[PDB]
Design a protein around this ligand. Structure first.
Ligand SMILES: C=CC1=C(C)/C(=C/c2[nH]c(/C=C3N=C(/C=C4\NC(=O)C(C)=C4C=C)C(C)=C\3CCC(=O)O)c(CCC(=O)O)c2C)NC1=O
Length: 212
């Protein structure tokens, strides 16, 4: 549409984004109703899906698609594992954690995108996760420190070590989106995938809200 991909993504995903953002689990977490335990469960599930997402990013980058956008400085899985070591006090969690049903679907989609090397689909998922982390991530980190006394060294996920000027980086991210060479089919595919990405994330929160 008329104002470029970054604008079309934001508008197209608005309804799914709002649903995800206002899940009961995330709402209770950010208001201080839960605890470090619940934050840890979230980060455990996020480690599972970021691990899958980053295999898909690596596959797509290697194909030569969206290279400048798929900045490896964004990788969260390793930082996340370090956070989880601190949150759980040992590496015990690696052999304990299991994917919730929501995370199974989400990982399965990311693995399909990986093995298909589906560039447009991968960009959609990259946008929903990383640009969200860059944008609202400092708010989440601040609330985890404020409400629950989480040590900032256990919030490495939100820090983005290697990025100095965060506002400039987000602006340049949106310009890289606008600059991607996409057919109508590819652009439509990307947009639909971005909505599905928000849908997966909402179900992840729903399953966390339950005993799952
Ligand atoms: C499934 C949950 C969830 C995801 C995946 C998410 C992603 C997400 N959050 C964004 C921005 C943002 N997101 C937030 C806030 C939050 N972000 C949060 O995850 C939480 C819990 C808050 C607290 C309200 C803020 C303040 C922005 C700023 C805006 C912007 O740059 O457009 C963007 C940027 C949009 C854009 O500029 O196009 C994305 C993709 N937001 C979500 O809520």
């Amino acid at each position: 549409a008329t104002a470029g991909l970054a604008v079309e993504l934001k508008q197209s995903t608005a309804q799914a984004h709002e649903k995800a953002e206002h899940s009961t689990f995330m709402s209770d977490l950010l208001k201080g109703r839960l605890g470090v335990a619940e934050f840890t469960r979230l980060q455990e599930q996020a480690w599972l899906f970021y691990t899958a997402l980053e295999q898909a990013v690596d596959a797509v980058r290697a194909s030569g698609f969206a290279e400048s956008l798929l900045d490896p400085a964004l990788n969260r899985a390793e930082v996340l594992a370090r956070d989880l070591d601190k949150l759980n006090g040992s590496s015990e969690w690696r052999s304990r954690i299991t994917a919730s049903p929501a995370v199974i679907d989400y990982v399965n989609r990311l693995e399909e995108i990986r093995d298909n090397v589906d560039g447009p689909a991968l960009v959609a998922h990259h946008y929903v996760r990383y640009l969200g982390d860059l944008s609202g991530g400092q708010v989440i980190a601040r609330m985890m420190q404020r409400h629950y006394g989480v040590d900032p060294e256990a919030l490495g996920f939100y820090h983005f070590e290697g990025i100095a000027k965060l506002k400039v980086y987000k602006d340049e991210y949106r310009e890289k989106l606008n600059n991607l060479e996409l057919s109508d089919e590819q652009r439509e595919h990307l947009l639909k995938e971005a909505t599905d990405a928000f849908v997966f994330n909402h179900q992840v929160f729903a399953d966390l809200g339950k005993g799952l």
